[PDB]
From a paper:
Colonization of these different niches involves an N-acetylglucosamine binding protein (GbpA) that has been reported to mediate bacterial attachment to both marine chitin and mammalian intestinal mucin through an unknown molecular mechanism. Recent studies have suggested that Vibrio cholerae secretes a protein that mediates adhesion in aquatic environments, e.g. to plankton, as well as adhesion to human intestinal cells. This protein, GlcNAc binding protein A (GbpA) binds to N-acetylglucosamine (GlcNAc)- containing carbohydrates, such as chitin, and is secreted by the type 2 secretion system. We report structural studies that reveal that GbpA possesses an unusual, elongated, four-domain structure, with domains 1 and 4 showing structural homology to chitin binding domains. Finally, mouse virulence assays show that only the first three domains of GbpA are required for colonization. These results explain how GbpA provides structural/functional modular interactions between V. cholerae, intestinal epithelium and chitinous exoskeletons.
Residue numbers in the entry:
A (entry chain A), B (entry chain B): 24 to 202, 209 to 414
The structure:
């Protein structure tokens, strides 16, 4: 288990790595990577690439269910790390120890299409770098000296770690860009949808702090602008249309090009401008959410049987409800969660994993359809002899 | 804009900080923080705490919409960072320059309840540490020498950064646990739901590598076990139930207590065991999703009016669809996304923001009900004068 990293001498972090760790130097992360963001070390799949191995369109994820998001492929989806042709050092960090057959590195063909899913077709299937593992366990960090072929613009390098004792390999794709008076100073991340009537805007900082003369404002006045990727694109575009000392969008050649996704923000050298943050104004209404819990007694008497909470839940709003029972020692004795529709009544019974006299509590959490906590309520009850 | 960090001499990172950055030493992250994970610098709310400011239950989020997930409060929800009473150093990192009135630090009362929403009553409202800002802008990173009061177990520290020239403050709560032959070895992280028929299991490593004899496996054989927090609890519980050299759960006193959430894994010093990773065996092959796109022509002539794509879309499986048009230079010219039900037919029209002769692509991405990418397909088309 492990991943391509850059803590020692590595030229560039793996795609999956940047889901968990910030890029060296720039601080960027990849976004919306799904579950693999919590275990970048586990992009493991069937060995035998390219003859067998992960199938086309499932190379970046290695067919792992946790890493499905990595298989998306467009020109603007992923953070790209600077690189040059010739001698370069690639670095792996291992969280677990495996006997190793070898490591192989592949690179996209010059004619690869950055908007098609990665495939054998997209790569030169003759690896540009191979390092022998000698069927022994490697140390916890390794550095590989490779010769990176000549390329221009955006390319993808596929690092494959072939393990010796199992029918498995680890696959880490790497997004690189082959190598002025514009300084990065923040970015527009599309991380939350908006509602009509809302407004998203920049907060621009000069030498004296925030300065409203430099703000750019986008009113959310159409259903299309409610989508995060859409208002992001639009705010980035409006910055370019209306400002002299600010630009936004991904760097494509010498141009700043707003995309439907993340849009970095840049400030003009000599402008005196320091950075930009984003602010959100929501004139919007607060849907009301509510989960009425009924059926909890004041006391439960310990009998020959396991203690049971027979409860009724009434939902106001569309939600996910999560209930947990804790004894007084912070030990969880029962838990339950389910989606509930606006106006739904449900009858449930929670069985306590154990019954000792004392103060207990039921914690009920309400999350909206988009998954954020709207409310938490904690109800006290007692077990008695 | 800024957050409580541990890049230099800070004792413990802010809760929000750990949504983006891995913890010092352990590499632990807070999970499912929502949008604020992409901007930990932005937990800004009304000033005047505790007399005014964010209301009870919205202290951790500072009433910010990005940060609502932070208001959840249970004994096991958040990563707890070790601390001791007495002299300690707290650290802030700033992304943006604000004139500062002061920094204040509060700690929970010894009788606080870790399972109730954070409130003024949970805190000693006499701050244990105050540092004057003198109404000037601070350096991009500051270190504050404080004296932490005597406490045991889990406590919350609220750090408040009061900004001088606006009616706002930044609020960063910090989860701390006040201070033998059980070594930290890995983590069961509830990042994904499973299916009946699946199995989740441990992969235990000793000096010879993966050792199959030490494996613990859990069959998902009930509706209940499909939920991530549920199988996490169950696997940790089964480890404790069947292994002599391994423990799983959050440390509560001297005991390892499995929780419905993240369960750390420990190995007995001198057992020969080094670490533990998690593996997943998934049985159901399905489903297949498809979005068939009809009406894309080979060529389109420019053009007195903007060029328009008359498409018919057909959905297989419940999904959300995303379409994007890219020109040859990979500037996005149009974007669309919406949910579709299994078998739905939708006809739409996409208008290109510009019409120049050359090779174009229409990219579609299918996400399943859970948000997991299921397919990507791209069609080539050409614009001509």
């Amino acid at each position: 288990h492990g991943y391509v990293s850059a803590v020692e001498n590595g030229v560039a972090e793996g795609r999956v790595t940047l889901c968990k760790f910030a890029a060296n130097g720039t601080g960027e992360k990849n976004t919306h990577c799904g579950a693999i963001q919590y275990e970048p070390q586990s992009v493991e799949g069937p060995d035998g690439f390219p003859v067998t191995g992960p199938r086309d369109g499932k190379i970046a994820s290695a067919e792992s269910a946790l890493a499905a998001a990595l298989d998306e492929q467009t020109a603007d989806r992923w953070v790209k790390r600077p690189i040059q042709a010739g001698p370069q050092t690639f670095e792996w960090t291992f969280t677990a120890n495996h006997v190793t057959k070898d490591w192989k590195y592949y690179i996209t063909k010059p004619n690869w299409n950055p908007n098609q899913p990665l495939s054998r077709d997209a790569f030169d299937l003759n690896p540009f770098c191979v390092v022998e593992g000698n069927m022994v366990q490697p140390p916890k960090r390794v550095s590989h000296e490779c010769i990176v072929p000549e390329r221009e613009g955006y390319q993808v390098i596929l690092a494959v770690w072939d393990v010796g004792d199992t029918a498995a390999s680890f696959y880490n794709v790497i997004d690189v860009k082959f190598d002025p008076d514009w300084n990065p100073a923040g970015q527009i991340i599309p991380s939350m949808d908006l509602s009509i009537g809302d407004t998203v805007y920049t907060r621009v900082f000069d030498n004296d702090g925030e300065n409203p003369a430099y703000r750019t404002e986008l009113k959310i006045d159409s259903e299309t602008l409610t989508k995060a990727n859409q208002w992001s694109y639009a705010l980035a575009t409006k910055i370019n249309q209306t400002q002299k000392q600010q630009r936004a969008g991904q760097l494509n050649g010498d141009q700043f090009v707003p995309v439907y996704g993340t849009n970095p923000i840049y400030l003009k050298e000599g402008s005196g401008l320091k950075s930009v943050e984003i602010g959100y104004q929501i004139e919007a209404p607060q849907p009301e959410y509510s989960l009425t819990v009924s059926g909890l007694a004041k006391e439960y008497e310990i009998g020959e049987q396991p203690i049971q909470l027979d409860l009724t839940l009434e939902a106001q709003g569309e939600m996910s409800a999560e209930l947990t029972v804790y004894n007084h020692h912070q030990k969880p004795l029962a838990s339950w969660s389910q989606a509930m529709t606006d106006g739904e009544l449900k009858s449930i019974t929670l069985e306590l994993s154990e019954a000792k006299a004392g103060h207990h509590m039921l914690v009920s959490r309400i999350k909206d359809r988009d998954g954020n906590l709207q409310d938490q309520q904690t109800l006290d009850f007692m077990l008695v002899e």
